[PDB]
Write a protein that binds this ligand. Structure first.
Ligand SMILES: [Mg+2]
Ligand SMILES: [Mg+2]
Ligand SMILES: [Mg+2]
Ligand SMILES: [Mg+2]
Ligand SMILES: [Mg+2]
Ligand SMILES: [Mg+2]
Ligand SMILES: [Mg+2]
Ligand SMILES: [Mg+2]
Ligand SMILES: [Mg+2]
Ligand SMILES: [Mg+2]
Ligand SMILES: [Mg+2]
Ligand SMILES: [Mg+2]
Ligand SMILES: [Mg+2]
Ligand SMILES: [Mg+2]
Ligand SMILES: [Mg+2]
Ligand SMILES: [Mg+2]
Ligand SMILES: [Mg+2]
Ligand SMILES: [Mg+2]
Ligand SMILES: [Mg+2]
Ligand SMILES: [Mg+2]
Ligand SMILES: [Mg+2]
Ligand SMILES: [Mg+2]
Ligand SMILES: [Mg+2]
Ligand SMILES: [Mg+2]
Ligand SMILES: [Mg+2]
Ligand SMILES: [Mg+2]
Ligand SMILES: [Mg+2]
Ligand SMILES: [Mg+2]
Ligand SMILES: [Mg+2]
Ligand SMILES: [Mg+2]
Ligand SMILES: [Mg+2]
Ligand SMILES: [Mg+2]
Ligand SMILES: [Mg+2]
Ligand SMILES: [Mg+2]
Ligand SMILES: [Mg+2]
Ligand SMILES: [Mg+2]
Ligand SMILES: [Mg+2]
Ligand SMILES: [Mg+2]
Ligand SMILES: [Mg+2]
Ligand SMILES: [Mg+2]
Ligand SMILES: [Mg+2]
Ligand SMILES: [Mg+2]
Ligand SMILES: [Mg+2]
Ligand SMILES: [Mg+2]
Ligand SMILES: [Mg+2]
Ligand SMILES: [Mg+2]
Ligand SMILES: [Mg+2]
Ligand SMILES: [Mg+2]
Ligand SMILES: [Mg+2]
Ligand SMILES: [Mg+2]
Ligand SMILES: [Mg+2]
Ligand SMILES: [Mg+2]
Ligand SMILES: [Mg+2]
Ligand SMILES: [Mg+2]
Ligand SMILES: [Mg+2]
Ligand SMILES: [Mg+2]
Ligand SMILES: [Mg+2]
Ligand SMILES: [Mg+2]
Ligand SMILES: [Mg+2]
Ligand SMILES: [Mg+2]
Ligand SMILES: [Mg+2]
Ligand SMILES: [Mg+2]
Ligand SMILES: [Mg+2]
Ligand SMILES: [Mg+2]
Ligand SMILES: [Mg+2]
Ligand SMILES: [Mg+2]
Ligand SMILES: [Mg+2]
Ligand SMILES: [Mg+2]
Ligand SMILES: [Mg+2]
Lengths: 101, 117, 113, 138, 50
RNA sequence: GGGGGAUGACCCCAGGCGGUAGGGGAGCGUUCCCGAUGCCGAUGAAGGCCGACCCGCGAGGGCGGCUGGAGGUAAGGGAAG
RNA sequence: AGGUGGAGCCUGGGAGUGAGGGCGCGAGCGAUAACGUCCGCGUCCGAGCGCGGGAACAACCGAGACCGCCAGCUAAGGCCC
RNA sequence: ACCGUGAGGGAAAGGUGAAAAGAACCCCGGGAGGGGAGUGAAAUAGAGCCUGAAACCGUGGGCUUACAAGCAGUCACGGCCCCGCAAGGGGUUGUGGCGUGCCUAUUGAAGCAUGAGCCGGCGACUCACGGUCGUGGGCGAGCUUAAGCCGUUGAGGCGGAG
């Protein structure tokens, strides 16, 4: 049993009991998110449509992340041009409890 | 007053060299060749960060296309099937379907195969 | 327990002497003794002198028991360089370096259980 | 979600006739099989791919004027050390080597591509090693 | 007023141009003079107002 | 830029944001002075060597451990080898 | 008349530049030669030797790169390996 | 010092410790040097002596490498070693994708055009007096003192020629 969900221009395959980092959304930690958006069943035939209606999955925001820092560097030879910018990209963790059809 | 270099130049050379740890030869041992090698690293990572996107999708496709030629059709038709059929799921990322969940893949093959058929 | 001797400011080039040190490393002191006498290099002398001063330091100091010994460790580091002018054609004058070695023999007791 | 990648797989073995199959057409697939791009676990850095065997190559057929006209070439490091070999001469001397060559050229260049070439075993006429499984194809 | 409270108005100590130090600060290498020729040269030019 | 009217720093919303010569604007760090007959300091100053840790777009600032053995010097401002 | 634009006009402060190149078009010089030379109108490179295509390649085709993503649609050019 | 016939040129080079208490004596050794002993808060403070960076050289350990080809990186996965309860991270690199050094000068450079063996120190937009804009404030039909004079724990004030 599994689903295929949609959050933040992306699609992930979720089990019940799956801790998963997702693009950051707004729920204060411990708040609960049904994401009325779902794309696939794992007992099959239900696929369909963009999105099977009536089904969603529930996950509880564990808290809001800031990822490890990417160093994004830009250099241009012979023109005396260099730039340095630090980047941490905010996320939210989710635990997937149960998937309702 | 006079302000000599003191500790400032030593410290910046130190920053960079630490970054270049692991690089071959003098490129890890000399603040000049480190700063040079680094420049290059900095651009390739950024280049390749836009390339990893290209890189990964490319793989997904071959894998999709591989699996449904087993079921005897194209990739190029397969996507069109899914496009009409509304099944705009795949997000070619989940050809983990195609590997891990075969009969889910098959069911998709037909949900595809019947539109224009 | 382990014993050590270190010769310092030996007037010899490290590269030269480091070569015979390689020759006896991890050897029982009785073979190491044998080799250096019959090894033909100037640096055999100097190294044997250190080996010995470290053999003495074993029994006499650290209570070691001579017939159990082998060479645990050894190496030569580079002490400061003696720089002399060497005059040359068309009045040029280079500088040659007479180099200097710090020789180290470290001794240990072969397991001898 | 991380993309799935395999772990060490069951190495397969396959068989082809080549009699009357033309060439590059036959070589196209032998390549794809060699890398095993048909398997949908497909891995670029890996080398999970079938071991192809070919018989009755030396019976390969070819279109056009190629038998007389087509030329293979080889250079020593030496002066005037370019050799020219007509397709017919090859065939009459080392039949296949021609399929071996058409495939070696369609396999990618690198240490990986050079492994897969080893996994291609070509013989002339019938028979071969009788060891492994070896299912067929047209 | 305390000796720490003192400080000037938001203008009034403006302070001040530098060069030829960073890439970044602009102002580097050629230090605001642009490559060139006589005016970039040390004592530079001939007195423009004439 | 336009709302919310905190009179702006905070919040939505919408746009712009390749760049050499060059113009503009914000900051970082170094030496010194006021702050100082103060404060930190041998239960360890400056400097050094590590860090996968925290804050900052970045220059940097923290913090922890090792070394080191007598100096260091906030907030806020001033001046430059 | 439409046209609110990193548009326009006026006053002032600080510049850099006054060696350009390719290509298309239109002319002269040249030989209806030159990666030739010299003007015009455009373009791009210069400063976009950042990205895709053209095997490789400043200026030809595609397209103006604020950062991130293991999401999607396209461009030119492609879809036997 | 040294260099120059001469006039003349002209450097390098400071630091044990609070105190010499500057290591008796024993051991290897020709001495040098070291090892114990001892001194000391500390001796990798031992006199080639505070701190002791970097190039550079060496020993030991982990990962790796003898059918691959390269501006040496980078993106991916996998192996082995390390740390961690876990998910996780650090190291290393087998394979695969991508990849034409820095600066300078140029129409245009990876360029087979200049510069640089590498590291550490030193090294280049200032100051005076005028000017001219802008800015922060004082006073405003006015504004403002110069020399000097008095006075002063680094105390100011006067002075109206101009
Ligand atoms: Mg370049
Ligand atoms: Mg250029
Ligand atoms: Mg300086
Ligand atoms: Mg894309
Ligand atoms: Mg001679
Ligand atoms: Mg002479
Ligand atoms: Mg030399
Ligand atoms: Mg600039
Ligand atoms: Mg500026
Ligand atoms: Mg200027
Ligand atoms: Mg210049
Ligand atoms: Mg010029
Ligand atoms: Mg002049
Ligand atoms: Mg004039
Ligand atoms: Mg925006
Ligand atoms: Mg910009
Ligand atoms: Mg105290
Ligand atoms: Mg200080
Ligand atoms: Mg201590
Ligand atoms: Mg410290
Ligand atoms: Mg200076
Ligand atoms: Mg109008
Ligand atoms: Mg304008
Ligand atoms: Mg103007
Ligand atoms: Mg001109
Ligand atoms: Mg012209
Ligand atoms: Mg035309
Ligand atoms: Mg022409
Ligand atoms: Mg021309
Ligand atoms: Mg033009
Ligand atoms: Mg130019
Ligand atoms: Mg432009
Ligand atoms: Mg190029
Ligand atoms: Mg290309
Ligand atoms: Mg290409
Ligand atoms: Mg291109
Ligand atoms: Mg281009
Ligand atoms: Mg843009
Ligand atoms: Mg498409
Ligand atoms: Mg093609
Ligand atoms: Mg004399
Ligand atoms: Mg002695
Ligand atoms: Mg004691
Ligand atoms: Mg000692
Ligand atoms: Mg120490
Ligand atoms: Mg000390
Ligand atoms: Mg010394
Ligand atoms: Mg002291
Ligand atoms: Mg010392
Ligand atoms: Mg060192
Ligand atoms: Mg080693
Ligand atoms: Mg071979
Ligand atoms: Mg090998
Ligand atoms: Mg080679
Ligand atoms: Mg690689
Ligand atoms: Mg240069
Ligand atoms: Mg030049
Ligand atoms: Mg030139
Ligand atoms: Mg030229
Ligand atoms: Mg060069
Ligand atoms: Mg070269
Ligand atoms: Mg030359
Ligand atoms: Mg020149
Ligand atoms: Mg330097
Ligand atoms: Mg300076
Ligand atoms: Mg002025
Ligand atoms: Mg003024
Ligand atoms: Mg005023
Ligand atoms: Mg007055």
């Amino acid at each position: 049993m599994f689903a295929i969900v949609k959050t933040g221009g992306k699609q992930y395959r979720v089990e019940p009991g799956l801790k998963l980092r997702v693009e950051k959304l707004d729920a204060e930690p411990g708040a609960t998110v049904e994401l009325p958006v779902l794309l696939l069943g794992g007992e099959k035939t239900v696929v369909g449509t963009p999105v099977v209606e009536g089904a969603s999955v529930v996950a509880e925001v564990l808290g809001h992340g800031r990822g490890k820092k990417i160093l994004v560097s830009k250099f241009k030879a012979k023109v005396q041009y260099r730039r340095k910018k630090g980047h941490r990209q905010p996320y939210t963790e989710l635990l997937i409890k149960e998937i309702r059809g | 007053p006079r302000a000599k270099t003191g500790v400032v130049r030593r410290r910046k050379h130190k920053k960079i060299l630490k970054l270049a740890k692991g690089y071959w030869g003098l490129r890890s041992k000399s603040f000049r060749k480190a700063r040079e090698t680094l420049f290059a690293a900095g651009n390739y990572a950024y280049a390749h960060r836009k390339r990893r996107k290209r890189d990964f999708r490319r793989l997904w496709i071959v894998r999709i296309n591989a699996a449904c030629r087993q079921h005897g059709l194209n990739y190029s038709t397969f996507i069109h099937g899914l496009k009409k059929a509304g099944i705009e799921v795949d997000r070619k990322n989940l050809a983990d379907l195609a590997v891990r969940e075969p009969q889910v893949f098959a069911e998709l093959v037909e949900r595809a195969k019947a539109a224009q058929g | 327990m382990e014993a050590k001797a270190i010769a310092r400011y030996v007037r010899i080039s490290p590269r030269k002497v480091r070569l015979v040190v390689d020759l006896i490393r991890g050897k029982s002191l009785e073979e190491a003794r044998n080799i250096l006498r019959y090894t033909n290099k100037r640096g055999a002398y100097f190294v044997a002198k250190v080996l010995e001063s470290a053999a003495a330091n074993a029994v006499n100091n650290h209570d070691m028991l001579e017939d159990r010994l082998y060479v645990k460790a050894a190496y030569v580091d580079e002490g400061p360089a003696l720089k002399r002018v060497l005059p040359r054609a068309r009045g040029r004058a280079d500088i040659i370096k007479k180099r200097t070695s710090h020789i180290t023999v470290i001794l240990g007791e072969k397991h001898g259980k | 979600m991380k993309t799935y990648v395999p772990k060490q797989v069951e190495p397969r073995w396959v068989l082809i006739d080549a009699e009357g199959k033309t060439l590059g057409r036959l070589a196209t697939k032998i390549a794809t099989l060699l890398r095993g791009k048909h398997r949908p676990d497909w891995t670029p850095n890996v080398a999970m791919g079938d071991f192809v065997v070919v018989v009755n190559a030396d019976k390969i057929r070819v279109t056009g004027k190629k038998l007389e006209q087509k030329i293979y070439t080889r250079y020593s490091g030496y002066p005037g050390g370019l050799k020219k070999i007509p397709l017919e001469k090859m065939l009459a001397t080392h039949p296949e080597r021609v399929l071996e060559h058409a495939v070696k050229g369609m396999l990618p260049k690198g240490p990986l591509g050079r492994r897969l070439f080893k996994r291609l075993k070509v013989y002339a006429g019938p028979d071969h090693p009788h060891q492994a499984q070896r299912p067929e194809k047209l | 007023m305390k000796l720490s409270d003192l400080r000037p108005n938001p203008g009034a100590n403006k302070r001040r141009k530098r060069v030829g130090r960073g890439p970044g600060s602009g102002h580097g290498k050629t230090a605001t003079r642009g490559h060139k020729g006589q005016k970039s040269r040390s004592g530079g030019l001939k007195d423009p107002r004439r």
